[PDB]
Amino acid sequence: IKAKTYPDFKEFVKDFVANVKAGKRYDFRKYQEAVLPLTYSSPWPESDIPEVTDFNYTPDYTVPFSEELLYSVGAQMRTADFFMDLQYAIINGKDVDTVYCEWLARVKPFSMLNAKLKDS
């Protein structure tokens, strides 16, 4: 994912899930501040997000909260953790319909991001 290729977050996450569906996996929880631009209306990503080949992520909680929600409405988690938990859902067979980012205000360490999930 090359830097500043997508003019907003909505079009960024549209091809982030598509890349994950294609077998591409990402991990940036250690250098999170270097890849997320501030404000969701800024071009995404701030810097190029490299691919990884050793993606082995097993979270300590049930990532699919309901059958149609990644987190309970109002749950706050680290922004880098949102992408990992989202990637966990696509791997296990859940499809992403809409990523909830309309009224969100923060991208850095903690953000209230959510996704509406679907089968297949």
Partner: protein, 366 residues
């Protein structure tokens, strides 16, 4: 203590009376924009003079040749004015026998009926004046029926300016459109003085305001602020100012050097069609927002005032050739004690002497 239902022999109580007064809007009237210009004659003229300037072309010295400048241009225009007349009558048979609402067994008098009739007439004239002022602000003075009385753009030979904000597109430059609107007044004022384009009134409707305050650029800009203004605009009451006709506080929003006020004024005519004050004649797409930007009173100064309203005397037997008035009310009694007649007159016209400064604003893209 009045007769109970089902029985004429037992009694009940009549506690009171609830009333539903219609909503009335007076924002433009209360703005004080249109200074009063009482008039004696039925028509008033106006002189329009202007000149132009150009760049000198270099001409050689030895061949003694020069340039000249075109003379001035002086024209003249005239204005007709609208006449409003409203008649109401009081008759003994709407007083005799009829019971005063909210009271058990006391009867209506002539005084209460006359007071309510006069109040309704005055309210009707006030809302008509507000609608006329808003129409004059639009640049075209169209009567409620639809007849044209004074098209300011053809009279002064100017073209209407409209700006498409394109609020739907998340990548739209709100700053660019705001700057365009700001510089249009300075460029087209042509008063010979120094203009400050930031002193304007931007009046928009509900949809335009909703799309403007929810734009991703504006909200993301104000969210990353630690000023009291941003805190109030994001998590706080967006209802500063106000004293509107209906609501105690109008919605307004500060983004640049300008403010956007949401005006919900609307009226109905006899035909039943509604007349939204903040609207564009033609557009009705429901999903597009419209607005009207006009210069502030303290922009061209008090010496050059462009918002005036005229008033001329009614055609009565002793008011001829006198200064005009806001409203005339006359008392006439029917012969043979058959009733009382009311007449209300108002002969006015609101106009703008610089129609180019009246700029329209839309929320869709061109």
């Amino acid at each position: 203590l009045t007769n109970s239902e089902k029985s004429r022999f037992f009694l009940a109580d009549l506690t009171g009376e609830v009333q539903s007064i219609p909503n009335t809007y007076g924002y433009i009237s209360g703005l004080g924009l249109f200074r009063s210009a009482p008039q004696t004659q039925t028509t008033f003229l106006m002189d329009l003079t202007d000149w132009d300037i150009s760049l000198l072309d270099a001409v050689d010295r030895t061949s003694r040749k020069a340039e000249t400048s075109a003379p001035e241009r002086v024209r003249q225009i005239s204005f007709p004015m609208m006449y409003f007349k409203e008649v109401e009558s009081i008759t003994p048979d709407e007083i005799q026998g009829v019971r005063q609402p909210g009271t058990a067994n006391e009867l209506t008098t002539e005084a209460v009926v006359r007071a309510k009739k006069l109040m309704k007439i005055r309210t009707k004239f006030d809302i008509t004046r507000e609608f006329l002022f808003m129409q004059a602000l639009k640049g075209k003075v169209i009567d409620a029926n639809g007849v044209l009385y004074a098209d300011l753009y053809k009279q002064f030979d100017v073209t209407k300016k409209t700006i498409y904000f394109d609020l739907d597109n998340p990548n739209s430059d709100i700053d660019a459109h705001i700057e365009d609107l700001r510089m249009h007044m300075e460029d087209e004022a042509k008063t010979g003085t120094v203009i400050n384009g930031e002193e304007i009134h931007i009046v928009v409707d509900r949809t335009f305001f909703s799309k403007l305050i929810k734009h991703p650029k504006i909200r993301d800009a104000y969210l990353a602020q630690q000023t009291p203004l941003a805190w109030q605009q994001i998590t706080g009451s967006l209802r500063t100012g106000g004293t509107d006709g209906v609501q105690a506080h109008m919605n307004r929003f500060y983004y640049g050097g300008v403010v956007f006020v949401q005006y919900n004024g609307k009226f109905k005519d006899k035909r039943g069609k509604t007349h939204t004050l903040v609207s564009i004649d033609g557009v009705s797409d429901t999903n597009v927002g419209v607005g009207h930007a006009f210069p502030n009173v303290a922009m061209l100064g008090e010496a050059n005032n462009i918002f005036e309203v005229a008033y001329a005397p009614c055609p009565k037997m002793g008011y001829a050739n006198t200064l005009g008035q806001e409203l005339y009310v006359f008392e006439y009694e029917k012969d043979r004690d058959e009733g009382i007649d009311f007449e209300a007159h108002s002969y006015m016209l609101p106009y703008c002497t610089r129609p180019q400064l009246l700029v329209d604003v839309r929320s869709d893209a061109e």
